[model samples]
Target: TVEAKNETFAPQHPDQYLSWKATSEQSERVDALAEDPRLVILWAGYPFSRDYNKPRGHAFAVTDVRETLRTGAPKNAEDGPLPMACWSCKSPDVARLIQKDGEDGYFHGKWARGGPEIVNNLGCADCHNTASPEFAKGKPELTLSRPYAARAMEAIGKPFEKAGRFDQQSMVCGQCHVEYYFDGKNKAVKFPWDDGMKVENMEQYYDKIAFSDWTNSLSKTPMLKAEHPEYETWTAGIHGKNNVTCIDCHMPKVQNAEGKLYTDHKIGNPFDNFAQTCANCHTQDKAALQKVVAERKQSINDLKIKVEDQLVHAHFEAKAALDAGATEAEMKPIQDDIRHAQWRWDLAIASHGIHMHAPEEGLRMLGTAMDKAADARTKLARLLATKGITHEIQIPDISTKEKAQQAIGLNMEQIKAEKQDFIKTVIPQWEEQARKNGLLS
Candidate 1:
């Protein structure tokens, strides 16, 4: 019976997988604009505050990457704030480009410098190897398309060969789905897994390396930005311990119009088709299971909002304290408070579904965040008292997203104008150049 079902797993024409636009339709969580304005307050002085939308499907990866202000609008490849290393996960073209050179220049150059060459969105090559027909034959036998994942695994004593086959099967998804950063010296993309994959482990690795993604202009704390870490968080979950891979939920098999079954590639909320997905492991009623996931998510959501307001208050109050001439020594402990608190908060929320995968762990992390944030505020209150300052250190009118961005000192008009120019004038040229070079047809 399983062998007969194998026919359903054959890679169907990509359109059947890639064209599911519903998967791309972002939720309020992805579109920062739709959520609380304090998020912009938390991410102030970073490009993310300028424009961050809910991520769409892989079909829109290349397009979304180009549009995000975080990349900055570049007149040319060598002109942006980011490096070419930024595209390492956005396109299969990354594989093609990295093949010609070792990962060195590909990872070190500017974001737009070689932009014209990477034209394809994520393609089969990213997941299916296609290195040889034999390699591509059955059960999604995979190859690590990206070298960084291979290297990170080696650091954790689970090199591909040492990793169980199920781990290898999951590793392909891990290639891009985990948290990573560019080495400061060479800008080569590297995962922070030397110590291990836990939130504290990765944070320890970064602290050891003295890596800071950015500094908050308000609090002046060296801040670390978390990219998605679904794989890492999931690894610490119940399902992960049981060897339930990402594909088991994200790519469950379903029948097509022809009654032929195939694994869905339009990865998204498992709840959308939980009968096929959740049914694989549980006999619980689907509605009951939905409520379980929802309740966990709701708990995280409440804690998330509470911690966020604390952070927003802390940042603004810290700025006022600094303006009142507080010494860096006076700020040190508070800065540490801000850093750890925000990091803990970001860990649970950024992971996408730790609430469902590991509810207890997620709650523990958020609880720590709340405690640290309160500590930071208490320190601010005491410092203000010593300075002979009174009256609840002047908080800004960050009542809405626009108000929040303005209070944080972002020029939204300028950022939008530059982004539009980059798309209109530069992206088109990049595509044309890629076509001319035969990188895109």
Candidate 2:
């Protein structure tokens, strides 16, 4: 047995600390949400409606960012849909560049404008101290390379510079894995954590700012797209209240070849290491605990789907009323309903696994979303009746991914063709530049 006195948190293989492992289950690829027809309807006008899939691994971050239609498949540095801020979370090269250019101006530039600049897939430097890649080489420290996250931490009164190693450990992951958006004025990346960490708190923050991500195509309501908010949701959970940072569960101690324990660093489902993780407190059987986890996830998913179905119907109903000559004034109340309902739904589901991390909060949000969506449908029906269309509106068939995309006016073939051209003609040059700069070499 490894003695506590001798145990060290040193990485047995420093290189392995950054290697993106391909654990079969965790890495299994599938479009977790994008494939669902309802998702296409929910995000009709967004690039996500064009294409989004389950991420392969940390190794695939850059590749995935390039492939996504959201980027606009820039054929050169001067072209792309997103701002340079998009590169912030995908690579450490941005950190290096930000050091010279400053974080503010980078966010204002076009994303493709820096395509050749951000090529590094640093094993550990992306989140740690970039000025000193070797800074947190031995232990978990809250060394941040991104100013947006640093600023957000300051806003929340948990400045990384002041945080202890234990707190810093989790905030490092929180740096990227939390809810954030680009400020409209300068496109500067900002996290909406000024109020608090709850879904309601973040919503209130966005509401106060009147920040709508996009207007719904069917309902014509201004909407907010909830980004992953793992840290926000986790902070209110049982483990979080007790100060069990992310590493305690996701990066629990595991023995190396020499029977020495170190933080595993293979951040993943804590359930996989329940014995090493949850066993620290819970004496329950592993099987029972796993069952509890699965049950919560399933319940949350079921409610989310229910809300999704209602929202889908709401969209089509609103569209039907509009087609039947309903004025914007007549649809205003229902549109507000659609906006709040979808916002709540996105809030609940957007954290990825908030249902398990914060079951009460997640379920409560979903339930509220369901109620809001249902209320919207009622108002929509009444509006349609006033427009002399009392009969049920015919919702179109959207069973497959293809059908959904077609319904939303997306030409996948045209988008893919443009992407292929960019990949063939532009990516090679960028890669060459990255290699020359010692980022991809």
TM-score of each: 0.91, 0.91
> Number of clashing residue pairs in every model?
6, 0
Q: Which stretches of candidate 2 lie over 4 Å from their true place?
A: 1-26, 33-35, 130-137
TM match of model 1 to true structure: 0.91
- Residue 5's lDDT within candidate 1 is 16
Query: Could you give candidate 1's per-residue lDDT for residues 341-411 as a string of tens digits?
Result: 88888877876677887787788888888988999999999998788877787678877878888888888
Off by over 4 Å in 1: 1-30, 135-139, 255-261
lDDT of each: 0.78, 0.76
Clashes of 2: 0
What residue pairs are clashing in model 2? none
